[PDB]
Design a protein around this ligand. Structure first.
Ligand SMILES: O=C(c1cccc(I)c1)[C@H]1CNC[C@@H]1c1ccc2c(=O)[nH]cnc2c1
Lengths: 337, 20
């Protein structure tokens, strides 16, 4: 059955993939309000679309900084992929455009803030709470992988909580459409699969490992592999050892042993039954996947809010006036954007 | 405790991606 749902999804996706939307708005159509988060070559700002009054989250990338960091192709990937996908737990890309200086991607604003903030503040989630979120990541990866996409940057910092307390995955900077295998060393140290660190060549199995890290971090309050130095983190990841808090249920430990499996030939989500080995695990036995997909399950908590455009669930960041050069930068490099 | 060691580590803030 789900076989059928994905089939139809892929046709919709493929059409947009081959004929992407381009230049669907202009900077002056948006009122810029406040920075919601930052990256090495840009920022995301809360904006208000003037003609409709809708609030959006507008990612602003400096073309010159994208080039210096060798992220041209990754950025083209991000935008091409994001304009073609459609899933309840994936943030929507509403418009994209560019000007002399920047690339712009206007996405839905998710007012609940990052899972990261909530997790650090409360310490750790209960198992039911973690499970509810993990289920949404399982369904989202199921969708994304059926499209030959790898996500490649799962972590709490990249998951937003919506007004219903459900997850919205954002940050498709490393997403890629690949059949077979890829080699780029990218991701976030705590979340890297052993095969990335080992320069092995890798595939969608790395997303399932990262799901292992995420669930662990959500339930424990810290990740399974951490140190002051990335190199010491890498050594722990490839050591093939992991320890669980004593409050982890036996089912949770069993699940995580199978996700944080250093051996591709043994990792859940990478065997014959694919994602169904995860969906059918006892830890998920209480999970009604259809109810989750349909947003019929009561969330562990709803973010607090006061009036639209309220940002209390996001940290404050240093603000920086936008400047658009009188000269076009890196035209050819971003032609297709 | 493992939790105390995490909180006292340099990696409890937002984590940057690596690119290269
Ligand atoms: O601000 C961000 C960002 C900035 C520059 C480059 C990159 I990659 C991500 C992302 C980082 N992770 C979360 C943050 C963010 C914050 C809010 C939203 C949002 O409301 N809608 C969509 N995506 C978001 C991303």
């Amino acid at each position: 059955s789900v076989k059928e749902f994905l089939a139809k999804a892929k046709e919709d996706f493929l059409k947009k993939w081959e004929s992407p939307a381009q230049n669907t708005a202009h900077l002056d159509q948006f009122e810029r309000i406040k920075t919601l988060g930052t990256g090495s070559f840009g920022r995301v700002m809360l904006v208000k679309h003037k003609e409709t009054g809708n609030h959006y989250a507008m990612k602003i990338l400096d073309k010159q900084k994208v080039v210096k960091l060798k992220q041209i192709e990754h950025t083209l990937n991000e935008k091409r992929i994001l304009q073609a996908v459609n899933f309840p737990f994936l943030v929507k890309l509403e418009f994209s455009f560019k000007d002399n200086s920047n690339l712009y991607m206007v996405m839905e604003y998710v007012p609940g803030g990052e899972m990261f903030s909530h997790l650090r503040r409360i310490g750790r989630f209960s198992e039911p709470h973690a499970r509810f979120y993990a289920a949404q990541i399982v369904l989202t990866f199921e969708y994304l992988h059926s499209l030959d996409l790898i996500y490649r940057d799962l972590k709490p910092e990249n998951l937003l909580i919506d007004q219903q307390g459900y997850i919205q995955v954002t940050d498709f900077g490393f997403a890629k459409r690949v059949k077979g295998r890829t080699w780029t060393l990218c991701g976030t140290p705590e979340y890297l699969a052993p095969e990335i660190i080992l320069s092995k060549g890798y595939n969608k199995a790395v997303d399932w490992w990262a799901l292992g890290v995420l669930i662990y971090e959500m339930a424990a309050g810290y990740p399974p592999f951490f140190a002051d130095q990335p190199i010491q983190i890498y050594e722990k990841i490839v050591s093939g050892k992991v320890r669980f808090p004593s409050h982890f249920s036996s089912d949770l430990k069993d699940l995580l042993r199978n996700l944080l499996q250093v051996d591709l030939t043994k990792r859940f989500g990478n065997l014959k039954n694919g994602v169904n080995d995860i969906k059918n695990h006892k830890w998920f036995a209480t999970t009604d996947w259809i109810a989750i997909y349909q947003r019929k399950v009561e969330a562990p908590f709803i973010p607090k809010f006061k009036g639209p455009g309220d940002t209390s669930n996001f940290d404050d960041y240093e603000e920086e006036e936008i400047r658009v050069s009188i000269n076009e930068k890196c035209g050819k490099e971003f032609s297709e954007f | 405790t493992t939790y105390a060691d995490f909180i006292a580590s340099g990696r409890t803030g937002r984590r940057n991606a690596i690119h290269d």
